[PDB]
Design a protein around this ligand. Structure first.
Ligand code: CLA
Ligand code: CLA
Ligand code: CLA
Ligand code: CLA
Ligand code: CLA
Ligand code: CLA
Ligand code: CLA
Ligand code: CLA
Ligand code: CLA
Ligand SMILES: CC1=C[C@H](O)CC(C)(C)[C@H]1/C=C/C(C)=C/C=C/C(C)=C/C=C/C=C(C)/C=C/C=C(C)/C=C/C1=C(C)C[C@H](O)CC1(C)C
Lengths: 39, 219, 214, 229, 203
């Protein structure tokens, strides 16, 4: 499990997880609050 | 020592010092010493309270046969009920904290706080509480705890018989003596796979909510 | 050694038999790291105890409803019925209360996991010994174990730990069954049991209509 | 054992003829452990004795009352006419269950304590003078052996062999009653009347017992021991 | 050395060198021949016994409905009317019970003797095997203690009857595809008119 979590901590896996989180957050914000142009 | 199951083994934490000890603790509830002492005090007060309750319910059934003991608070001799609750709470609070600090600090609650009590055992007051002793100490302790446990079982029977019959205890005994084959709980309640016959409780749902005790799990 | 989940297969080497319910079952080796294993032990205990409470609170009201004494709604409808019957209690207020209360108790449990016995300092209303904890996932003390069934003897404690973990795993599997049976039949679990008891050769997963969509 | 259940086979090492009726028969190895073997010996003893009483009671019930099915003996209209108290005297079956439940809870818990610890409940609980000898497990004696008939091993062998025969016969009784709808002696008479025209090949496909019966307001579901129609 | 060893391995599949791992090892292949043989004997007896007993009137079911491929195994070819349980619930039970039997047998193959250690309601006494996976024996699997001196001859007879049964089950399948009748129906048509009922007339 230690070796597996080290693999999950390699740069592309962390990049995949973080960018999936960020893209999903942006997508769900735009789903819940459609068409934001201004604050 | 006489055991609740003869030919069996008593648990190690029940040595036999307490009165009415027959090595009955399959759950291990008294396997802690301070818990055993607290539970001994609790069993004593439960035994005495159920003893007085069984006697009082039997007398009330004998003396006033027109009053259901379950609904005996409707017929008690309208805002004055709150004051009686206050008096009962005050007196009960005083005597209970006296007993509780007798338990917590033995001998500290052994003196009259207005104008004295002899040295005694925790849970066995003595003094003015014990003016006459027609017997020995251990023997009468065994009688007290045995009669108390019988009265606790009897009060549970009184409550649940009142729920399933709507009548008093001696009326229920008379109904059992009239028809011994068709008045037992086995006679009216049957559960088999696919069909359950649950007797109704004749006590109403509310008057103040008055629920039948776990009536949905009755057999 | 001990009894294992797959007889003839050696147990998972990181499982040594000390934990309750150790049948050597870890085919994915999820408990290889000991600290992660302690975390997963607390996870399993919290899941199992929650499952046992929930399965009791589904089964006993559904048994009482089946008897006809009461009319408690089935578990998959109870939130809707409660909300329809409680218009002065909004859903968000109930959720906020639940979140803050569970947050308090779960943060205390979390901080005890990070620092064992650190909630014993008396900061919460003077409680010291009752928050020290006996072992990982087993708090004990006079508050969580007021009848003292963990402080009697060692073998009694191991027996009760075995009872707890096995009933908890059974209740988790039972809740999975509750979900699957409600999705397949649209009824409650006691309704399912009664339908199976009335006609067992006809009332099976094969005849509910969704387990076999042919 | 010595004479084995089949020619050429071997007895297990834990079955060497110590117990009565030892034929070296344990294909599944269930009695390999001594505690399990002792428990199954007690179970076999009580099973054999209940089957003995069952066979002798079914057979004698057909002689005295041939018109009442032993399978249907549990219905209230098939009982003997006796006064059970109440307003009419009719049976309830609730108190009928209750008496047997309490008495057998007492006597079987006494027997179970005997099983768990040998010679531990030999002593009479109320009138302490009475004492049961109990030479071996499952053989209490004393009040249970008034005539003193205990060669102990030979009569033990007689008991266990006749008991195993009684269990086999009771299974035959139940399957014959389910397949034919008649008592065992009627089955014997029917086999004697038309042997080739009335045998197991003419009755094994039918379950004559109804799928459900109603017993004063509660409906007991019933089933045969095999999927007959 | 091996029972029923005719030296017939034209694809050299029982060669031991290089075939160490996997299922092409000699031990697995002899074991699999034995398992196939015993299952085939059960199948070859069982795929024609209901038809024979129905034709002779021993069982009351009609001979058409107890034909092996019309009794529920292939519902496009027919379903038997109303067993005590529906075939899919029966298959569920079959999966559970047969998985128990087969996984315990497999654990004896990979770890010989291991099925006699863990508690199995006392049944582990007779499940230790013999160290030979094809021939466990013991107090149940050889409960009559046969083959005291002719165990190799009995192994040869078992394998010979199993190979014959394997060929017979293949014949049952081929004849079912070609004729759409039971194997006993085929045998009786060949017996009643041998020139007018055979593979040349069925084609
Ligand atoms: C990791 C990024 C991310 C975040 C922050 C959220 C956040 C949310 N999702 Mg979303 N989701 C994501 C990724 C994410 N999702 C991905 C990759 C999928 C599969 C394509 C989904 C599929 C999904 C469904 C199907 C639903 C949500 C719903 C929700 C909401 C409640 C949970 C919440 C706003 C639920 C909802 O919309 O509100 C109740 C809901 O039904 N999500
Ligand atoms: C520098 C370049 C740039 C800038 C300034 C913007 C700005 C914006 N874009 Mg455009 N966009 C760009 C490049 C850019 N975009 C590119 C390269 C593409 C092609 C991939 C797009 C495709 C695109 C689409 C298809 C949409 C936008 C939308 C938006 C709006 C998102 C607002 C929001 O989500 O608030 C939410 C606020 C936050 C997420 C702040 C984070 C707060 C945290 C949680 C605290 C915002 C006006 C959306 C909009 O509706 O347009 C008006 C919209 O639908 N963008
Ligand atoms: C556990 C003790 C206990 C409690 C809580 C009660 C409670 C009650 N009793 Mg009993 N009772 C008891 C023991 C108890 N009884 C004992 C030991 C006796 C025999 C001395 C009685 C003899 C008795 C009679 C004869 C009657 C009550 C009645 C009552 C009710 C009114 C009492 C009253 O008005 O007194 C004010 C002073 C009340 C519900 C009366 C009633 O209304 O209900 C049946 C009633 O007629 N009680
Ligand atoms: C019939 C049940 C029963 C029995 C056999 C006893 C027996 C005993 N009691 Mg209890 N007790 C009972 C019911 C009983 N009590 C009830 C209903 C109450 C509440 C009113 C009490 C409250 C009580 C107190 C407060 C004390 C006792 C004491 C005693 C002991 C000496 C007094 C005596 O001899 O009483 C004889 C009783 C009958 C003949 C009846 C003895 C062990 C004293 C003690 O514990 O040790 C000296 C003592 O101080 N008892
Ligand atoms: C995991 C544990 C769990 C959860 C999440 C629930 C959840 C629920 N139960 Mg259930 N229950 C449980 C365990 C649980 N139960 C157990 C172990 C039993 C036995 C029951 C017996 C039970 C019954 C008999 C009923 C519920 C009902 C309910 C619902 C209303 C709860 C309520 O009104 O609070 C009540 C809150 C209080 C009494 C106040 C809190 C007390 C503090 C000290 C103040 C809710 C869906 C009711 C329902 O189904 O629909 C309304 C209902 O009739 N429960
Ligand atoms: C099968 C159920 C079961 C069993 C055997 C145990 C056993 C144990 N628990 Mg656990 N527990 C359970 C369910 C159980 N628990 C549930 C549902 C919860 C969540 C409410 C917990 C939460 C919990 C905590 C927080 C703690 C324990 C602790 C303990 C230990 C001492 C207490 C005891 O012996 O109880 C014995 C249990 C029984 C005799 C069975 C009671 C069954 C009841 C009466 C049924 C009630 C049904 C009703 C509808 C609800 C022991 C290892 C303490 C500890 O771990 O010790 C160091 C401790 O601090 N438990
Ligand atoms: C492997 C042997 C075998 C199997 C699996 C079956 C299977 C079946 N037979 Mg059958 N049978 C067999 C051999 C078998 N038979 C033999 C050798 C005889 C003659 C003695 C019969 C005489 C027979 C009759 C008279 C009937 C069945 C019926 C049935 C069906 C209902 C179950 C039953 O009645 O059990 C019977 C149990 C045994 C025969 C035990 C042997 C079931 C599909 C019934 C049917 O056809 O439809 C429901 C039915 O009425 N069987
Ligand atoms: C390009 C495809 C390919 C090739 C060239 C091979 C080649 C080989 N395989 Mg691998 N294999 C494959 C695909 C392939 N396999 C796939 C898709 C799987 C998963 C289903 C496997 C799983 C597998 C196992 C589990 C085993 C092999 C074995 C073998 C060897 C002997 C095979 C044999 O005797 O055939 C003859 C084929 C049969 C006797 C059975 C055919 C029946 C199927 C249904 C057709 C040989 C090196 C064996 C080996 O490694 O040990 C020496 C062995 O045990 N293979
Ligand atoms: C791989 C072997 C195999 C398989 C899969 C089948 C499959 C089938 N057979 Mg064949 N069969 C076989 C081998 C097989 N057979 C062999 C070798 C023979 C020659 C003896 C037969 C002779 C045969 C006949 C004569 C019949 C079948 C029938 C059937 C069908 C119904 C089976 C059934 O009802 O189960 C019934 C289940 C059991 C018999 C076992 C139940 C055991 C219970 C659960 C426990 C009992 C415990 C209890 C204590 C036992 C005490 C009894 C006592 C006497 C000892 C099914 C298609 C029937 C038919 O064709 O379809 C309608 C039918 O009439 N088979
Ligand atoms: C050796 C050699 C060598 C070289 O080297 C190579 C080569 C050449 C390759 C080889 C050859 C070979 C051979 C030919 C193989 C084949 C086979 C067989 C056929 C199998 C089977 C096998 C077969 C078997 C399993 C079987 C079994 C059967 C079964 C049980 C059945 C069952 C049935 C029953 C009864 C009845 C019902 O109704 C249904 C069913 C359910 C359907």
């Amino acid at each position: 499990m230690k070796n597996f979590t080290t693999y999950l901590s390699t740069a592309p896996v962390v990049a995949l997880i973080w960018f999936t989180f960020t893209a999903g957050l942006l997508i769900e914000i735009n789903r819940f609050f459609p068409d934001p142009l201004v604050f | 020592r006489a055991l609740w199951l003869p030919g069996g083994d008593a648990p190690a934490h029940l040595d036999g010092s307490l009165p009415g000890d027959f090595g009955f603790d399959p759950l291990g509830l008294g396997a802690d010493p301070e818990r055993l002492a607290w539970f001994a005090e609790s069993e004593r007060v439960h035994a005495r309270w159920a003893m007085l309750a069984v006697a009082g319910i039997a007398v009330q059934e004998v003396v006033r046969p027109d009053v259901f003991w379950y609904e005996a608070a409707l017929k008690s001799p309208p805002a004055a009920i709150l004051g009686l609750v206050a008096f009962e709470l005050f007196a009960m609070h005083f005597v209970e904290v006296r007993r509780a600090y007798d338990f917590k600090n033995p001998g500290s609650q052994d003196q009259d706080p207005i104008f004295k009590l002899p040295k005694h055992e925790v849970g066995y007051p003595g003094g003015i509480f014990a003016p006459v002793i027609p017997g020995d100490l251990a023997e009468l302790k065994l009688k007290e705890i045995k009669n108390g446990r019988l009265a606790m079982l009897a009060f549970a029977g009184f409550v649940m018989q009142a729920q399933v019959t709507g009548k008093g205890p001696l009326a229920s005994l008379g109904d059992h003596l009239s028809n011994p084959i068709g008045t037992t709980i086995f006679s009216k309640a049957v559960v088999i796979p696919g069909q359950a016959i649950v007797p109704p409780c004749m006590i109403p749902s509310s008057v103040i909510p008055t629920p039948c005790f776990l009536s949905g799990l009755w057999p | 050694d001990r009894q294992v989940w797959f007889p003839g297969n050696a147990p998972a080497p990181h499982l040594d038999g000390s934990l309750p319910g150790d049948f050597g079952f870890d085919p994915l080796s999820l408990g290889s790291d000991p600290q992660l294993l302690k975390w997963f032990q607390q996870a399993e205990l919290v899941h199992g105890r929650t499952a046992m409470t929930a399965v009791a609170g589904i089964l006993f009201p559904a048994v009482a409803t089946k008897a006809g004494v009461v009319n408690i709604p089935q578990w998959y409808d109870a939130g809707s019925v409660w909300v329809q019957n409680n218009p002065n209690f909004p859903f968000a207020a109930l959720l906020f209360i639940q979140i803050i209360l569970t947050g308090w108790v779960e943060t205390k449990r979390w901080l005890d996991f990070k620092n064992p016995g650190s909630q014993a300092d008396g900061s919460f209303l003077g409680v010291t010994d009752d928050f020290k904890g006996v072992a990982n996932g087993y708090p004990g003390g006079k508050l969580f174990d007021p009848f003292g069934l963990s402080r009697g003897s060692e073998g009694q404690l191991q027996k009760y730990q075995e009872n707890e973990i096995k009933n908890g795993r059974l209740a988790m599997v039972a809740f999975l069954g509750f979900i699957a049976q409600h999705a397949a039949t649209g009824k409650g679990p006691i309704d399912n049991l009664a339908d199976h008891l009335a006609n067992p050769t006809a009332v099976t997963f094969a005849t509910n209509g969704v387990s076999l969509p042919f | 054992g010595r004479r084995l259940w089949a020619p050429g086979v071997e007895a297990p090492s834990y079955l060497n003829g110590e117990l009565a009726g030892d034929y070296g028969w344990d294909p599944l190895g269930l009695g390999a452990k001594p505690e399990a073997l002792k428990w199954y010996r007690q179970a076999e003893l009580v099973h054999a004795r209940w089957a003995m009483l069952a066979v002798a009671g079914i057979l004698a019930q057909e002689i005295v009352k041939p018109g009442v099915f032993f399978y249907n003996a549990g219905l209230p209209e098939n009982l003997p006419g006796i006064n059970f108290g109440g307003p009419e005297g009719k049976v309830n079956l609730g108190g009928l269950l209750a008496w047997e439940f309490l008495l057998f809870h007492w006597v079987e818990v006494r027997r179970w304590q005997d099983i768990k610890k040998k010679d531990s409940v030999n002593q009479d609980p109320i009138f302490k003078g009475n004492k049961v000898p109990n030479p071996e497990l499952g053989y209490p004696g004393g009040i249970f052996d008034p005539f003193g008939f205990s060669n102990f091993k030979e009569v033990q062998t007689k008991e266990i062999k006749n008991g195993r025969l009684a269990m086999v016969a009771f299974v035959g009784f139940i399957i014959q009653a389910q397949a034919t709808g008649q008592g065992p002696l009627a089955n014997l008479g029917a086999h004697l009347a038309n042997p080739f025209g009335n045998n197991i090949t003419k009755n094994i496909g039918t379950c004559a017992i109804p799928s459900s019966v109603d017993v004063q307001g509660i409906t007991i579901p019933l089933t045969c021991l095999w999927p007959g129609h | 050395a091996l029972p029923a060893d005719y030296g017939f391995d034209p694809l050299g599949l029982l060669d031991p060198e290089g075939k160490g791992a996997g299922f092409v090892s000699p031990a697995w292949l002899q074991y699999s021949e034995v398992i196939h043989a015993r299952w085939a004997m059960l199948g070859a007896a069982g795929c024609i016994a209901p038809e024979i007993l129905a034709t002779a009137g021993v069982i009351p079911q009609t001979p058409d409905e107890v034909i092996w491929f019309k009794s529920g195994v292939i519902p496009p070819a027919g379903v038997y009317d109303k067993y005590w349980l529906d075939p899919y619930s029966l298959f569920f039970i079959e999966v559970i019970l047969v998985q128990f039997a087969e996984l315990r047998r497999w654990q004896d193959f990979r770890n010989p003797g291991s099925q006699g250690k863990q508690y199995f309601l006392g049944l582990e006494e007779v499940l230790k095997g013999s160290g030979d996976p094809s021939y466990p024996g013991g107090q149940f699997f050889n409960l009559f203690n046969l083959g005291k001196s002719d165990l190799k001859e009995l192994k040869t007879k078992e394998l010979k009857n199993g190979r014959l049964a394997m060929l017979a089950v293949f014949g049952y399948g081929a004849q079912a595809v070609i004729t759409a009748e039971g194997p006993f129906k085929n045998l009786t048509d060949h017996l009643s008119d041998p020139t007018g009922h055979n593979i040349l007339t069925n084609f």
